[PDB]
């Protein structure tokens, strides 16, 4: 089996005292590194690092494309939270065509 | 330079795409192909003034119900379509399409449209309906539905025969502009 595991990580350059990072004992050393980078550097200024919200995703099954979002007018609010839209929420079948473009 | 956003909804196979292709490209499709979503842009005249038309062709199937509301925002007029030969599609005008429109588009004008009118004068088809105790939808029944739903107008057309096709969109742009 596996096990949840909270760890204390220190980053030399940033100088923060310590950062709690929730990982799994079955995570590899590469997975753990990216788990840390997504917590210290995803919010650091980097003009060449595309984040999902600095990026548009359109869908066109025909000659016209439409933008798909995590939460738009079609999002069903399930429970305490608004359920984030999925690919089968929009009913995107296999072999579809998408467009990626910056904002 | 006035622009108008037109959106067609209605049960699958009721003839939404054929109506648009005949109006835009002047071509009727013999093979049925379920539409996902398309945007047709048409320049027309209204009382002597040019009016651009952004027209959206939606999916009538139940499998795309979660994607369809994406095209309701900023609408100027809504064409609620049904098949005259299919009493089911005429019911879903009020059972299914009106609640969905009333939910999102509370203020967008509704124009009910009866499609495949040419099929009313087909002996081989109407008798198949009459043997099952069902008659094709008549004008006074399409009108009472538009009245019950609260539509502004109610029109009929046949994409197979180009009849009353250009008139459907002239009335759509007139209602959309006069209500602006
Ligand atoms: N006889 C006749 N057949 C028609 C007429 N309009 C459409 N059809 C036929 O009805 C079928 C459905 O046409 P279509 O326009 O694709 O319907 P739809 O509403 O766009 N389907 P969907 O909503 O799933 O995209 C096709 O086989 C088409 O040839 C009409 O005026 N007369
Ligand atoms: Mg279609
Ligand atoms: Mg189905």
Numbering used by the authors:
A (entry chain C): 1463 to 1565
B (entry chain A): 15 to 194
The article reads:
Plexins are semaphorin receptors that play essential roles in mammalian neuronal axon guidance and in many other important mammalian biological processes. Plexin consists of a large multi-domain extracellular module including the ligand-binding Sema domain, a single-pass transmembrane helix, and an intracellular module that includes a GTPase-activating protein (GAP) domain and a Rho-family GTPase-binding domain (RBD). Plexin signaling depends on a semaphorin-induced dimerization mechanism and is modulated by small GTPases of the Rho family, of which RND1 serves as a plexin activator yet its close homolog RhoD an inhibitor. RhoD binds plexin RBD with similar affinity as RND1, but it strongly inhibits plexin signaling rather than activates it.
To experimentally determine the binding mode between plexin and RhoD, a negative plexin regulator, we screened various combinations of RhoD and the intracellular region of plexin family members from different species for crystallization, which resulted in crystals of the complex of mouse plexin B2 and human RhoD bound to the GTP analogue GMP-PNP. Analyses of the diffraction data suggested that plexin B2 degraded during the incubation in crystallization drops, and the crystals only contained the complex between RhoD and the RBD of plexin B2. We solved the structure to 3.1 Å resolution by molecular replacement. The asymmetric unit of the crystal contains two RhoD molecules, each of which binds to one plexin B2 RBD molecule. Surprisingly, the two RBD domains form a domain-swapped dimer in the structure, with the N-terminal portion of one molecule fold together with the C-terminal portion of the other. This domain-swapped dimer is likely a crystallization artifact because it cannot form in the context of a plexin dimer, in which the two RBD domains are far apart from one another. We therefore consider each RBD domain formed by the two halves of the two molecules as a representative of one intact, unswapped RBD as its conformation is very similar to the structures of other RBDs. The structure confirms that RhoD binds the plexin B2 RBD in a mode similar to those of other complexes between Rho-family GTPases and plexin. The GTP analogue GMP-PNP and Mg2+ together stabilize the ligand-binding switch I and switch II regions in the active conformation, which make an extensive interface with one side of the beta-sheet of the RBD. Interestingly, a superimposition of the RhoD/plexin B2-RBD complex with the RND1/plexin B1-RBD complex based on the RBD domains shows that the orientation of RhoD and RND1 relative to the RBD domains is slightly different.
